């Protein structure tokens, strides 16, 4: 395990003048982690919803919004002591690979400040307190896209990533739809199945009973030709002169990305530091934050992942010709 | 109403250089209800001396301004960093090297080829001086504890209205969303 | 130090072209083509807070139920009352 | 045209200098190395490479 570093044949006279100007102190360097995060892991029971979370009173001097998602526990290490015996699954660890595939499970997220005020709130939203994501059945009319997201999501999500939204829902322009982002994902979908309580015979014939492809194909199992040959019992024919009735459904896979909830007063992003991050009453005093997600049940106990996006810059200063003095900072969550 | 008032301490934000909030001396104060008019007449007066000290050290250390906590300190009242001109001793004669390398075969694994050498004294401070926000060693110099010799006695307007933490002096309004 | 944190970690201070020493800025604007240094100095971007947002109440999505409507054998014509609030500018593209 | 001079080392510098561990430590589930990454006077190194 050897290093290997390609230097730069930089003539020396003009090194000693790019190495004695990068060593004064008003000219020092300064990298910022691209994914400014304060990621936390919030366990969820086997089959449960509404994972509440609370944070003690603190500052939010430069908070820039949340970024949350869901991850199965089997695919997340302990992050410490290296070897984690309980970590036994190797397939595309979402926590690390960047691949996320549970974003159609969320139902609704609430944010409360001091235990009294909702945070998107001020009425800047539809259903005031509850950035709703999906919203299943109950649609007095809000589900936005032939899909099941809620029109005033898809106005926080779009308008947060590709700043589109409040002045004409375009088709995100490319150089702002880069893989790990929205539109290159919401893949609305929808189907139709025999509305049991209407067609009169939704006999629910269980998978091990359907006799279709009589037997030209296999038996219950990828085995040989046992057959006989009758019509069948496939699916209620829902596309033809006699089609039994119906009832639809609609899902919205948003894999390979994370929901984003910017801290700016208007969800649109102007600068790297929100229009509301430097708001006095979010940087001039301490506050407590109580927020509650809601996810539909899934077996095999899962885990919830959240980003408290926050500036994470670092300055580097080195005057003594052989020393480096590094400085770190995280404005929210400096610990 | 009162007169020997108890100075209003100034809070800091290690973030944007400007200060933050303000409040009467929350903690540091005596408890004289267990005293009679022989030291309740001296606590009253020790506090007055404290007030006078605060006034003098405010008028002697601060830089007279027009707004208690300015929203953006001008670029001439904020302590600037004036480093010294950095002098790099350019460690070779470029002409000499290039010449010899072209000539002969020197591949050159002071100098021997030529006794020429020159410094390259540069500038070190900055291009445009810093503008907004003062450092701690300026906070404890500008915002000396403020003594409010009378309470909020006036119309809404005239009232140190840089004290309330939730003030946006840019728009003269209390922020929200809390 | 003796600098505000953000202006020191460069979150809300000047940009690269301003706080650098003139020698360094000249060199970097020079050595861009083959030994660029543009990714090693932060340019703090701050969204203007004042004059772009409102504390007071506002809506972002509005539901306008039809006021009147005729149903024909081939046309469903609806009449709304598009009401826009004071100091509220609507862009019909939305 | 390219710069005539003042940007090129004329003596024996080394592109892609190599370093090897001056200290090693192996555990049942980890590997620990530390190199004396010496930039060398009159030079400038970018760790992107």
């Amino acid at each position: 395990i050897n290093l290997y570093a390609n230097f730069f044949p930089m003539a020396h006279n003009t090194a000693s003048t790019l190495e004695a100007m990068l060593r004064n102190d008003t000219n020092d360097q300064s990298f910022n982690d691209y994914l400014c995060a304060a990621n936390m892991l919030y366990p969820i029971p086997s089959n449960a919803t509404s994972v509440p979370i609370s944070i003690p009173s603190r500052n939010w001097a430069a908070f820039r919004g949340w970024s949350f998602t869901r991850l199965k526990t089997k695919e997340t290490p302990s992050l410490g002591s290296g070897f984690d015996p309980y970590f036994t699954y190797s397939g595309s660890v979402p926590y690390l690979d960047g691949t996320f595939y549970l974003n159609h499970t969320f139902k609704k997220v609430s944010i409360m400040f001091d235990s009294s005020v909702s945070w998107p709130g001020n009425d800047r939203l539809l259903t005031p307190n509850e950035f709703e994501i999906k919203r299943t059945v109950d649609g007095e009319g809000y589900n936005v896209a032939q899909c099941n997201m809620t029109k005033d999501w898809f106005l926080i999500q779009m308008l947060s990533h590709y700043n589109i939204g409040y002045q004409g829902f375009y088709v995100p322009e490319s150089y702002k739809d880069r893989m790990y982002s929205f539109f290159r994902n919401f893949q609305p979908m929808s189907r139709q199945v025999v509305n049991t309580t209407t067609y009169k015979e939704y006999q629910n014939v269980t998978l091990p009973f359907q006799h279709n492809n009589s037997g030209f194909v296999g038996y219950m199992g990828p085995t040989m030709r046992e057959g006989q040959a009758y019509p069948a019992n496939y699916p209620y024919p829902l596309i033809g002169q006699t089609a039994v009735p119906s009832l639809t459904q609609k899902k919205f896979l948003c894999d390979r990305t994370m929901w984003r909830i910017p801290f700016s007063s208007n969800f649109m992003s102007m600068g790297a530091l929100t229009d509301l991050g430097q708001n006095m009453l979010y940087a001039n005093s301490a506050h407590a934050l109580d927020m509650t997600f809601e996810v539909d049940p899934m077996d095999e106990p899962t885990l919830l992942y959240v980003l408290f996006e926050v500036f994470d810059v670092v300055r580097i200063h080195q005057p003594h010709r052989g020393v480096i003095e590094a400085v770190y900072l995280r404005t929210p969550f400096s610990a | 109403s009162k007169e020997i008032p108890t100075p209003y301490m100034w809070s800091y934000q290690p973030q944007m250089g400007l200060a933050a909030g303000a409040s009467q001396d929350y903690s540091s104060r005596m408890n004289w209800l267990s005293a009679g008019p022989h030291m309740i007449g001296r606590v009253n007066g020790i506090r007055a001396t404290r007030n006078q000290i605060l006034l003098e050290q405010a008028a002697l250390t601060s830089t007279p301004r027009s707004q208690l906590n300015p929203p953006n300190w001008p670029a001439a009242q904020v302590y600037q960093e004036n480093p010294a001109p950095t002098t790099v001793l350019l460690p070779r004669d470029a002409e000499a090297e290039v010449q010899m390398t072209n000539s002969g075969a020197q591949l050159a694994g002071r100098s021997s080829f030529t006794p020429r050498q020159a410094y390259l004294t540069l500038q070190s401070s900055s291009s445009q001086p810093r503008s907004g926000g003062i450092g701690t060693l300026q906070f404890v110099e500008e915002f000396v504890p403020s003594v409010y010799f009378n309470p909020f006695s006036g119309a809404p307007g005239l009232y140190p209205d840089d004290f309330i933490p939730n003030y946006d002096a840019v728009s003269e309004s209390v922020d929200g969303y809390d | 130090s003796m600098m505000p944190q953000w202006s020191y970690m460069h979150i809300a201070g000047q940009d690269a072209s301003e706080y650098l020493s003139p020698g360094l800025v000249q060199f970097a604007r020079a050595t861009d083509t083959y030994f660029s240094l543009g990714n090693k100095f932060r340019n703090p971007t701050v969204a203007p807070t004042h004059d772009v947002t409102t504390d007071r109440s506002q809506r972002l999505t509005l539901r306008f139920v039809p006021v009147d409507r005729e149903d024909t054998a081939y046309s469903y014509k609806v009449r709304f009352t598009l009401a826009v609030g004071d100091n509220r500018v609507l862009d019909m593209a939305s | 045209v390219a710069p005539t001079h003042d940007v090129t080392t004329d003596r024996s510098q080394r592109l892609t200098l190599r370093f090897v561990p001056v200290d090693r430590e192996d555990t049942a589930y980890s590997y620990k190395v530390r190199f004396t990454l010496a930039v060398g006077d009159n030079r400038v190194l970018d760790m992107a490479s």
């Binding site: 003009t14 003048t17 | 390259l120 004294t121 540069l122 | 020698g23 000249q26 060199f27 604007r29 020079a30 050595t31 861009d32 083509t33 | 045209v1 390219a2 710069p3 005539t4 001079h5 003042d6 940007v7």
Partner: peptide
């Protein structure tokens, strides 16, 4: 101070090359 260092080593188009 009998000179100025400046800095023009930047390819060269003509008498030029920066920004």
């Amino acid at each position: 101070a009998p000179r100025h260092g400046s800095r023009p080593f930047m390819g060269t188009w003509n008498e030029i090359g920066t920004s």
